[PDB]
Amino acid sequence: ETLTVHAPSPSTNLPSYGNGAFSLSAPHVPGAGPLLVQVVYSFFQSPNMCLQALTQLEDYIKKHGASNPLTLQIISTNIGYFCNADRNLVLHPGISVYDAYHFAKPAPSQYDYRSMNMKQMSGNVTTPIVALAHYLWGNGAERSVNIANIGLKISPMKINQIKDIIKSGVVGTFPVSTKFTHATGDYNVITGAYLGNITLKTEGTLTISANGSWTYNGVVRSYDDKYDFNASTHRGIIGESLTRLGAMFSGKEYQILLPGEIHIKESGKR
Ligand SMILES: [Mg+2]
């Protein structure tokens, strides 16, 4: 019968992340000055800022109680901080996750989910927690992320181009047109967590040379129209955090849209 967490709103949001009691913390580096500024800037670009945040939420529940009102305030506020930052990243592309999280207007503690929530997610490291947001509070509404933002790394050796073990190469030219399943969770802990396994389509050329070396020059887009956000679809360590949290609190399954197209070129040797 699970617990409800109040959506982020000025009316209920705590004044700061962790209400002061805990914080996002970079790795330790000796020194002072602008050096330390770089350290926190790069830490907000790491997937570890997302894992730390989730872990610190999980840790606080264990220590204080899932139904403790303050815990419930903390889940809501903290997620909202992520929701606000991810909003800044969508509305100001190519800016730093740090500056997105810390942009003073609008105030991050004044984030209002009901009026501010967006279909579009950035695909940056903030997105997994925002994906949790939309489960908690989205009411099965549809979301979206561009495939150009999910940090795709293709390894043609895992596709249908692997049927080059036929040694036929060269050339040089081999037309490729295939659908394939791609496990983002295998290498990308951000994307794996909320998208997990996706189905992709690729058209392009495979260039194998006389000495076993090969290049695949092609285009990738989503094969399936949509993907389900539920516990069975989460992949990787962060996905596991999402699953444990989502079981504990009330929410609704939704679909995520994956539009757009990328260009890849990937080489190797037999
Ligand atoms: Mg790190």
Side-chain angles (χ1 to χ4, degrees), residues 4-13 72-73 75-77 79-80 111-115 117 133 136-139:
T4 290
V5 187
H6 202 291
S9 73
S11 185
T12 53
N13 291 156
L72 289 178
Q73 273 183 280
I75 295 143
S76 176
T77 303
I79 289 182
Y111 180 80
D112 179 68
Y113 180 84
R114 294 291 168 243
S115 85
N117 77 277
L136 300 180
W137 307 304
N139 280 85

Side-chain angles (χ1 to χ4, degrees), residues 176-178 201-205 216-221 261:
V176 167
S177 200
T178 190
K201 179 67 204 276
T202 183
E203 306 83 2
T205 319
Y216 178 59
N217 202 12
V219 280
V220 189
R221 77 167 75 71
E261 198 185 49

